[PDB]
Design a protein around this ligand. Sequence first.
Ligand code: EE1
Ligand code: CL
Length: 419
Amino acid sequence: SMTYDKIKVPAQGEAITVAADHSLHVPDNPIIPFIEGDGIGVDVTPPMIRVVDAAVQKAYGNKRKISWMEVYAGEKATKVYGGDQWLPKETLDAMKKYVVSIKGPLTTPVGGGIRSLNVAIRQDMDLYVCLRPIRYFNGVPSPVREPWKTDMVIFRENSEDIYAGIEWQADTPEAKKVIQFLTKEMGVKKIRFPEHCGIGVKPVSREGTTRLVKAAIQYAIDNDRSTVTLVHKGNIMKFTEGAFKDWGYQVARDSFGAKEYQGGPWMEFKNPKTGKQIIINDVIADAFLQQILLRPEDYSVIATLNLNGDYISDALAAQVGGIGIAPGANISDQMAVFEATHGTAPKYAGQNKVNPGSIILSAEMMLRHMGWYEAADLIIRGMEGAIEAKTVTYDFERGMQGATLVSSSGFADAMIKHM
Ligand SMILES: NC(=O)C1=CN([C@@H]2O[C@H](COP(=O)(O)OP(=O)(O)OC[C@H]3O[C@@H](n4cnc5c(N)ncnc54)[C@H](OP(=O)(O)O)[C@@H]3O)[C@@H](O)[C@H]2O)C=C[C@H]1[C@H](CC(=O)O)C(=O)C(=O)O
Ligand SMILES: [Cl-]
């Protein structure tokens, strides 16, 4: 019964719930919380909502309708709730209760200031999978000669690694205390400059690695993908990134019956639904950034740590058009917050300039998560039709031949027209 301080539950609409069998029960009138986003969030979130509403109306008529429910984070939260209220508890309360949500990007200051609200949401909700499909749409400009060979899905660990935010600033009493502990109690001799020295900590665990790699292997099973590649810098970081690799291979053996492939260290098992062989292998992270460019055909599902996945997501997105057409999801079983790969691009904020494609395709992922496949298919149809008409935002316009420039809202208009 309890109302919120600033959130308003829609007058019509019903909550998604988790069914007894752990699937989602999605009402025909579902409530979906959304965060507008800082910066270019104002440019891309409102067109996304229109595009979703248009796909839902065309696929289902009067029968289904999303009840969008705004919830607040970032600058808009400090506007609505007051100074320093960057992430109100009721924002998180509502996103958990209503199960499925979507957010624009949020700003994280460099070198000081608040810790990332995007990480804060992921960790509070324990959305330990960051899932980022890398897909080439025909006609999108690419820096690469054969962008269609790039077809990958990134499983980025989303709850630990150096993203844990554990660090102390140079010359503070706390950093001096940590350095004294390291040098005097742990016998650390390898800090080259212990004065005026910032210190960060990187935790990587068996349980955290296990649940991320298990999800990635299951995805490969459920989507008929042939390879899962563990990406790590385990020669230099032996006990974090190297342990990630070892624990990941153990998941294949322990939970999917994998055995050594051709002497190891790669592993193999047979897809339990199709009988086709899935290979689990591993690549050192720096070498991997070359391999995705020179041999993208050899990779399918990627499983990697928090930091590595962040870097790799942008490197791969660049091959298929950039982070203007790069969607994502933060997932824990059925709970999910859909989210573009890109940030707040503050130099463009409010200009109606940037590509809403990333957040729109994140909504496409949201619709499939809800089982609303017909509406999701119309989003893809509209996207393909708008690209084929070459009515595109500035990031595509500059690479295409004979294209017509449209605004962020103008690109949403073009998608709806082609549904
Ligand atoms: N909320 C989030 O989840 C994120 C927000 N952050 C914040 O954003 C600010 C600015 O960061 P920034 O480095 O400027 O990156 P961003 O992506 O915003 O823009 C770079 C260039 O990408 C091109 N570009 C981007 N968008 C579009 C588009 N729509 N259309 C066309 N081109 C686009 C454009 O390229 P151009 O055309 O100009 O050459 C642009 O300039 C910082 O506060 C970060 O913290 C960034 C990433 C994630 C988080 C990090 C976190 O938690 O803070 C993360 O790590 C992850 O999980 O992935
Ligand atoms: Cl407002």
